[PDB]
Structures are given as C-alpha cells and as structure tokens.
C-alpha cells in the first residue's frame, strides 16, 4: 500500500553531501586524531559513522559524549580556528607515543597539552575575547594521572584542578588519580569538556595544574546536517531519503525500515 | 582485537634438553617503537591457578628460575627453558595487556620426551549388569604407552564407527613418562545385540602395524 | 600474605544467574585494576573482564558482553562478577586476579556448571579380566552420573599401584561417566579379591564393586 517497507541496503552520495569516516569517529576528528586529521576542516550534510572506526591516541572520555557529538554533526563543519593563547610559565605541545603523529611522539592536533618549565607550574590565568558574530566552540581537557608520583612530575602541585568560565557558563574540574586499565598501553586518562562562547563573551581559563588547552575554536553553525550510523556502503546513485538500512523511496507516505532518518522522508509508523 | 596465536601446541623435550614456545600477535604490542611489550608468559599445572613466570616479554617474575627466559618485541615472542626439567612439564600460555579486550594464547602442552613405547591393548564387554540397565557399553585400553598420538578406532562386523564413542588419557605417568587411554564404544542395548563382532582397532608408532582385540556374543 | 578467595560457584540452571565474589588480602586492594579469568574443562585460560581503581571504567570479552558486569566494593576489598542468562559453554573455572601488568596473583578459583542435568548418582559396572602375558587388566566403568566429581579407590586404598583413573567424559545426555582400571599379576586372579570403592558425594552415593574373571 503505502508504507514503505524495503531499503536497498546502500547509502546513495547524492544529493546530499555524505561523508563517510571510514574508521573515524566525529569525536576523533573533532579532537584530531592523528589517523583522522584527513577530516581536518572538513563539512557534510551527514556524516556517516562505522562499527569499524577504533581510538588510536590517548585513552579519554567525554563527559556528555552524545551532547557533544549531536551540536557537532549538526553544525556541519569542523572549521577550526586556531587562536594565539598564550602559556606562561609551562611547556606546551605534549605527546604520547600511544598517539604516533609518523615515528615520534604526538597527541590530538586540536589540544596543547602542558606541563611543568623547570620545576614550576605557575597558575595560568588566560582571557579569550570573542569580538566576531558567530558561537565560538572551544574543546578543552584535563589528565587524570595514574599515580601520586606522576601526578607531581608532570605537574608539580600534589592535586592540580581546571576551571574554564564564561558569563554563561562555569565548569570546574578536579583530576581524579587512579589506576585504570590498559589501554593502548596506558593506565592514565584525559576527559574532555567543551564550552561555547557567544558574540561579545570571553573565554575564562584557570589551572594549576593538568590542563589540556585549547587552540582555537570551531567555527558553530546552524544546519540540517547530522550523523547516522550505519555500515551501509556508499554508491553514486540518487536518493533524498536516507536510514541506516540505506536509501528509501519517499513517494509512499509512510515507512517500516527504520525510525532515524535523513532528508524529506515519509513518517515511521510503528507497522 | 588482538588475537594470540601460540606455536607449537605440543611439545616434547628431553630432560635437560632447551625448550622453545611461540607467541605470534595479530596487532602490535609494543607501547610506541619502545622495548615496553605488554606480554606475560604462564605455567598451569593440573588443578591449579596459572602462574606468571615472565612479565613485559623479558621480566622474570620473583622466585622464577633462571632457566626461563622471553623475548621478543612487537608482535612475534619466544619463552625458553633451557635445563628441562620434570618439574617444567606443564601448559604454558601467552598474554597480552596492551589494550583490552585482553586476551591468552590457546596454550602449549610441553610433556617429557622419552623414548617409544607400545600400547598393551585390552578389550571389555558390556557387563552382565549393565546390559540389564537396557545399556551396553564396550571398553577398549591402551595402557602404558609413548607418544600421546594414538589412533582407536571402533568396528562392529567390519563397520568402521563414528560419534558413538568417548575416550580419555591419563596424565603423563612421574615415572615412567608414558600415557594410558580408554576408548567406550556405547550403544543401546537392542542396538547392541544387532551385531556380532565387536573390535578395537589401535594404531600406534610403536606396533609393527594396527594391533586389533576383539570379541563375539552381542 | 597477599591472597584472592573466590566463591559463589554451583551448578546453575541454564538461563538463570548467580553472583561470584572474590576477597583480596595483604595489598592495597583499591589501588589495583582487577580481572576475571575463567577456563572451561579441558580447555585454555579465557579472559573475562577487568575493572580499574574505582569501578568508573570496565571491560569484558564479546563473549560475556552484555550478560556478565564486573564490579568491586573497596570499603570491603571485594571483586564482584553478576553473570545473567548463563548458557552451558560459560560451565568453567573462575578465577579473579590482580594486574601487575601481566596479572601476578591469582586465587584458587570457584567452579560454575550450567547445566539442565538433574543430580544422579552413578552406576558401576565391572569390567572383568579375561583372555596381555601374566598381567591382567580389570577395573570399574563409572557410568552417568551428575555432577562432578567421583572418586575411585581399588581395595580400600590398599591397591594403589597399577591403577589409573580416567577423566570422565561429559555424554550427550548431560551425565559424565569415567572408568578406573587396574593391571595385576594374572596369576593372583582366583586368589585376591578386586573391589573398587567408587564415592559421589553430590548425590550421597557410596559404592563398592567386585570385579571378578
Ligand atoms: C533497519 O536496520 C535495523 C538494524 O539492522 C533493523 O532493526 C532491527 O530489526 C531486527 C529484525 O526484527 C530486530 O531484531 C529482533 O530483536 C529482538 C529483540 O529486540 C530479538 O528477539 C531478535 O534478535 C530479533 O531479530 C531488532 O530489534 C531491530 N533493532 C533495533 C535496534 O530496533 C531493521 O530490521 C532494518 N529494516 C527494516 C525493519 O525494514
Ligand atoms: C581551516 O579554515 C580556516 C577558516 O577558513 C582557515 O583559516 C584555516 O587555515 C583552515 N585550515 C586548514 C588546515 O585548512
Ligand atoms: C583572572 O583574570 C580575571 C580577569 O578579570 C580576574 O577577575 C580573575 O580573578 C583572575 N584570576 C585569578 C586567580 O587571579
């Protein structure tokens, strides 16, 4: 009748502009990942993640992942901005060889990490102004050392803590030391947190010690875009319908195949 | 996901011979191009817990013989033991910790070699209880014997059998180092009385060529 | 001294669930990444899963995923395993073990049999000697009980030597039988008297067979 009940099990890449992250998640090439900066200031109408993708840098977490992952998919663009913060008082550009940019150590290419010049961490008191017309998007972490012992050879202060404020905003981090399990070869974790800073607001960031800095900010939009998963593979042919099953018809009204949807689709309707 | 595969399965050494397992992973290991391997090697003997003898590829654990040594960097790794003693017979595994899911080679049966040795064979009827029972259960044993590669097989008037027997070995004698086996050929009891001839078949290094035993009345 | 006990195990009902325990000693317990390792009969060691300091991260193997959660409780040093929908191939040892990098301490384990098998005690049948060159070969088939594990003695304990006890074989109808066969002089077969003395405890049986020519 009139519920469309089929897919073709296949993701046309028209007429809507389909990146495929083959082995990449939207997280990962927001961040940078070394095996992901291929995405580097890429945009898409839809980004399509794969069971396939893997994390092959420092072992993280983000707080509220799916928050992040959806304002992301939906501006539709990883401009990034890179902005001149300036780190007195610390060594920048830290690395890990369980994140290799080629053969030696690297770390996120969005992210700066910092520890101790000398035998000081001083408290760095830095300011962002935001003077443009657009949302500002900056994406910020703090490490989570394994040991009390490496706790104070990075960072020299016993507990460090992070704070990243805005008028409309105010998120106070402090490390949580602890063993965690292997992974990619480390026992320590960095979280991520992100904050968005509108026209005429600044950026507040405080930290005596474990902060993971920001670069530069994202350039946010306000878009039709968003994010599917699906293993479908992606051919040339043309559907304005998209699921996770692959392309739809969208002349009949209604629809069984799946409940996410992309494009002018027909309505779900519970068969 | 990392995948361990250990090489050879089985392995017989002479005492005070060396001893040699082989650890392959599927994926790297190895932390950057560092020398940190996040690999263990283990021991198992009969009934007990594992125990870690190497830890990161190289390090021997506290108490651990000098004997046992690891390499290997990156994906492909050796355990050695290099006075082989009767103490060492046991199942040895690999491990990796790099980054979960975590996981063991499928283990490496090391016995003591010793020279050839050819099975006694012996045949057993079903008892007179059991075939009461409405069950009927015919035992054939190979005891005493060495290498552990024996092939038993079941013919009933000539019928080579299959999936309707089990067999079980012993551990590898303290002293004498070889092995026994039991083979139960099991049927039903109407099953059972259908046929005449019940037979084991062995074949085995140490018989100039297939030693049979049989019997009659089913 | 630095010790695991495990415990929780039995024989459990397909389907159904039941919680193991592991309680550390003589370490800094909450300190350590912890882990099960389990090891089905006969079979190689199978990671299960693993938990760091706090239990704020875990991970388990794709074969448990989303039936077993690892958990531990430090104000009592006590490593936790929930297994849900158990299915016969999770029957296996269970041990916990701490991370040193390549798991240093181990406890003795605790034994998880899924299975649909009601318990039963076993039959014994003698296998008699008859017709290799003085030597004759006798012993007791332990046939279909549930579940392990039974023990065999010939003559009270007096008859040691020569004796082999097999491990039981796991049948298609969920019982295990083994047999125990002992090689004697065959000159000594209308002389000394052959009994094998066969206990399962699971099922409160105690029996003594007589395996004559
Ligand atoms: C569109 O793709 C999705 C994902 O591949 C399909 O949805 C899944 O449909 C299967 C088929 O019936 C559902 O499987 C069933 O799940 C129950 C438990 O909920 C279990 O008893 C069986 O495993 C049974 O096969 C599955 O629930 C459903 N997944 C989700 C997340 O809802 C769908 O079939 C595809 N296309 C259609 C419906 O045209
Ligand atoms: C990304 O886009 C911004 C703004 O258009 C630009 O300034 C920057 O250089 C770009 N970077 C790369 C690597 O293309
Ligand atoms: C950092 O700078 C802001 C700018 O007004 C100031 O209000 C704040 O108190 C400073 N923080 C510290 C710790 O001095």
Same mark, same amino acid.
């Given at each position: 009748?009139?519920?469309?009940?089929?897919?073709?099990?296949?993701?046309?890449?028209?007429?809507?502009?389909?990146?495929?992250?083959?082995?990449?998640?939207?997280?990962?090439? @927001?961040?940078?990942?070394?095996?992901?900066?291929?995405?580097?200031?890429?945009?898409?109408?839809?980004?399509?993640?794969? =069971?396939?993708?893997?994390?092959?840098?420092?072992?993280?977490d983000?707080?509220?992942?799916?928050?992040?992952?959806?304002?992301?998919?939906?501006?539709?663009?990883?401009? +990034?901005?890179?902005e001149?913060?300036?780190?007195?008082?610390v060594?920048?550009?830290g690395?890990?060889?369980?994140?290799?940019?080629?053969?030696?150590?690297?770390?996120?290419?969005?992210?700066?990490?910092?520890?101790?010049?000398?035998?000081?961490?001083?408290?760095?008191?830095?300011?962002?102004?935001?003077?443009?017309? +657009?949302?500002?998007?900056?994406?910020?972490?703090?490490?989570?050392?394994?040991?009390? !012992?490496?706790?104070?050879?990075?960072?020299?202060?016993?507990?460090?803590?992070?704070?990243?404020?805005?008028?409309?905003?105010?998120?106070?981090?402090?490390?949580?030391?602890?063993?965690?399990?292997?992974?990619?070869?480390?026992?320590?974790?960095?979280?991520?947190?992100?904050?968005?800073?509108?026209?005429?607001?600044?950026?507040?960031?405080?930290?005596?010690?474990?902060?993971i800095?920001?670069?530069?900010?994202?350039?946010? #939009?306000? /878009?039709?875009?968003?994010?599917?998963?699906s293993?479908?593979?992606?051919?040339?042919?043309?559907?304005?319908?998209?699921?996770?099953?692959?392309?739809i018809?969208?002349?009949?009204?209604?629809?069984?195949?799946?409940?996410?949807?992309?494009?002018?689709?027909?309505?779900?309707?519970?068969? | 996901?990392?995948?361990?595969?250990?090489?050879?399965?089985?392995?017989?050494?002479? @005492?005070?011979?060396?001893?040699?397992?082989?650890?392959?992973?599927?994926?790297?290991?190895? +932390?950057?191009?560092?020398?940190?391997?996040? *690999?263990?090697?283990?021991?198992q003997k009969?009934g !007990?817990?594992?125990?870690?003898?190497?830890?990161?590829?190289?390090?021997?654990?506290?108490?651990?013989?000098?004997?046992?040594?690891?390499? /290997?960097?990156?994906?492909?790794?050796?355990?050695?033991?290099?006075?082989?003693?009767?103490?060492?017979?046991?199942?040895?595994?690999?491990?990796?910790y790099?980054?979960?899911?975590?996981?063991?080679? !499928?283990?490496?049966?090391?016995?003591?070699? #010793?020279?050839?040795?050819?099975?006694?064979?012996?045949?057993?009827?079903?008892?007179?209880?059991?075939?009461?029972?409405?069950?009927a259960?015919?035992?054939? &044993?190979?005891?005493?014997? $060495?290498?552990?590669?024996?092939?038993?097989?079941?013919?009933?008037?000539?019928?080579?059998?299959?999936?309707?027997?089990?067999?079980?070995?012993?551990?590898?004698?303290?002293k004498?180092?070889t $092995?026994?086996?039991?083979?139960?050929?099991?049927? =039903?009891?109407?099953?059972?009385?259908?046929?005449?001839?019940?037979?084991?078949?062995?074949?085995?290094?140490?018989?100039?060529?297939?030693?049979?035993?049989?019997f009659? #009345? /089913? | 001294?630095?010790?695991l006990?495990?415990?929780?195990?039995?024989?459990?009902?397909?389907?159904?669930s039941?919680?193991?325990?592991?309680?550390?000693?003589?370490?800094?317990?909450?300190?350590?990444?912890?882990?099960?390792? #389990?090891?089905?009969?006969?079979?190689?060691?199978?990671?299960?899963?693993?938990?760091?300091?706090?239990?704020?991260?875990?991970?388990?193997?794709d074969?448990?995923?989303?039936?077993?959660?690892?958990?531990?409780?430090?104000?009592?040093?006590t490593?936790? *395993?929930?297994?849900?929908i &158990?299915?016969?191939?999770?029957?296996? %040892?269970?041990?916990?073990?701490?991370?040193?990098?390549? *798991?240093d301490?181990?406890?003795?384990?605790?034994?998880?049999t899924?299975?649909?098998?009601?318990?039963?005690?076993?039959?014994?049948?003698?296998?008699?000697?008859?017709?290799?060159?003085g030597?004759?070969? @006798? /012993?007791?088939?332990?046939?279909?009980?549930?579940?392990?594990?039974?023990?065999?003695?010939?003559?009270?304990?007096?008859?040691?030597?020569?004796?082999?006890?097999?491990?039981?074989?796991?049948?298609?109808?969920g019982?295990?039988?083994?047999?125990? %066969?002992?090689?004697?002089?065959?000159?000594? &077969?209308?002389?000394?008297?052959?009994?094998?003395?066969?206990?399962?405890?699971?099922?409160?049986?105690?029996?003594?067979?007589?395996?004559?020519?």
């Amino acid at each position: 009748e009139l519920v469309q009940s089929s897919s073709t099990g296949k993701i046309c890449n028209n007429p809507h502009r389909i990146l495929d992250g083959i082995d990449c998640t939207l997280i990962d090439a @927001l961040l940078g990942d070394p095996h992901c900066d291929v995405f580097q200031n890429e945009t898409w109408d839809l980004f399509v993640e794969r =069971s396939k993708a893997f994390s092959n840098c420092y072992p993280y977490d983000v707080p509220d992942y799916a928050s992040l992952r959806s304002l992301v998919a939906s501006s539709g663009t990883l401009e +990034f901005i890179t902005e001149g913060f300036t780190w007195t008082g610390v060594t920048q550009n830290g690395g890990s060889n369980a994140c290799k940019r080629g053969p030696g150590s690297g770390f996120f290419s969005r992210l700066n990490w910092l520890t101790k010049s000398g035998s000081t961490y001083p408290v760095l008191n830095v300011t962002m102004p935001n003077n443009d017309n +657009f949302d500002k998007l900056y994406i910020w972490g703090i490490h989570h050392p394994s040991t009390d !012992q490496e706790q104070t050879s990075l960072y020299v202060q016993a507990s460090g803590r992070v704070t990243v404020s805005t008028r409309r905003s105010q998120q106070t981090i402090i490390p949580n030391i602890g063993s965690r399990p292997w992974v990619r070869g480390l026992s320590s974790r960095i979280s991520i947190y992100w904050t968005i800073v509108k026209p005429g607001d600044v950026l507040v960031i405080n930290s005596n010690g474990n902060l993971i800095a920001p670069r530069g900010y994202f350039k946010m #939009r306000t /878009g039709k875009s968003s994010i599917m998963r699906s293993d479908a593979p992606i051919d040339t042919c043309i559907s304005e319908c998209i699921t996770p099953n692959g392309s739809i018809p969208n002349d009949k009204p209604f629809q069984n195949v799946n409940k996410i949807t992309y494009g002018a689709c027909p309505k779900y309707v519970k068969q | 996901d990392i995948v361990m595969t250990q090489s050879p399965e089985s392995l017989a050494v002479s @005492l005070g011979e060396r001893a040699t397992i082989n650890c392959k992973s599927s994926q790297s290991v190895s +932390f950057g191009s560092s020398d940190k391997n996040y *690999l263990g090697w283990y021991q198992q003997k009969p009934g !007990q817990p594992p125990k870690l003898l190497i830890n990161w590829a190289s390090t021997r654990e506290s108490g651990v013989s000098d004997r046992f040594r690891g390499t /290997g960097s990156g994906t492909d790794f050796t355990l050695t033991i290099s006075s082989l003693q009767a103490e060492d017979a046991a199942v040895y595994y690999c491990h990796q910790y790099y980054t979960p899911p975590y996981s063991f080679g !499928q283990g490496t049966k090391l016995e003591i070699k #010793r020279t050839v040795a050819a099975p006694s064979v012996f045949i057993f009827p079903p008892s007179d209880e059991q075939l009461k029972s409405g069950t009927a259960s015919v035992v054939c &044993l190979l005891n005493n014997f $060495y290498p552990r590669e024996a092939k038993v097989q079941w013919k009933v008037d000539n019928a080579l059998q299959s999936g309707n027997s089990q067999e079980s070995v012993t551990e590898q004698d303290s002293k004498d180092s070889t $092995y026994s086996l039991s083979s139960t050929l099991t049927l =039903s009891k109407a099953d059972y009385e259908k046929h005449k001839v019940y037979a084991c078949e062995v074949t085995h290094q140490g018989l100039s060529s297939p030693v049979t035993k049989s019997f009659n #009345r /089913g | 001294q630095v010790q695991l006990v495990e415990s929780g195990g039995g024989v459990v009902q397909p389907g159904r669930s039941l919680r193991l325990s592991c309680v550390a000693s003589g370490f800094t317990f909450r300190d350590s990444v912890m882990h099960w390792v #389990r090891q089905a009969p006969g079979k190689g060691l199978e990671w299960v899963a693993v938990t760091s300091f706090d239990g704020g991260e875990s991970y388990s193997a794709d074969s448990v995923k989303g039936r077993f959660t690892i958990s531990r409780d430090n104000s009592k040093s006590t490593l936790s *395993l929930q297994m849900n929908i &158990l299915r016969p191939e999770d029957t296996g %040892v269970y041990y916990c073990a701490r991370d040193r990098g390549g *798991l240093d301490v181990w406890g003795q384990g605790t034994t998880v049999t899924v299975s649909g098998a009601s318990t039963k005690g076993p039959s014994v049948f003698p296998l008699a000697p008859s017709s290799s060159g003085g030597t004759a070969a @006798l /012993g007791c088939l332990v046939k279909d009980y549930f579940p392990e594990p039974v023990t065999v003695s010939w003559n009270s304990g007096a008859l040691t030597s020569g004796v082999h006890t097999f491990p039981a074989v796991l049948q298609s109808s969920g019982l295990y039988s083994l047999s125990s %066969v002992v090689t004697v002089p065959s000159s000594s &077969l209308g002389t000394q008297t052959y009994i094998c003395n066969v206990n399962h405890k699971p099922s409160n049986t105690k029996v003594d067979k007589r395996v004559e020519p």
